[PDB]
Design a protein around this ligand. Structure first.
Ligand SMILES: [Zn+2]
Length: 37
């Protein structure tokens, strides 16, 4: 009705992908991109 229904939005700008669970996003990057390294 009238209430900001929480909803996180994480997108791998790098590959313009989408991951429901952020935890996966991080693992996906360090696995594919791995820029930090
Ligand atoms: Zn990616």
């Amino acid at each position: 009705g009238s209430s900001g229904s929480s909803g996180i939005k994480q997108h791998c700008r790098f590959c313009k992908k989408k991951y429901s669970d952020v935890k996966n996003l991080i693992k996906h990057i360090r696995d594919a991109h791995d820029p930090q390294d």
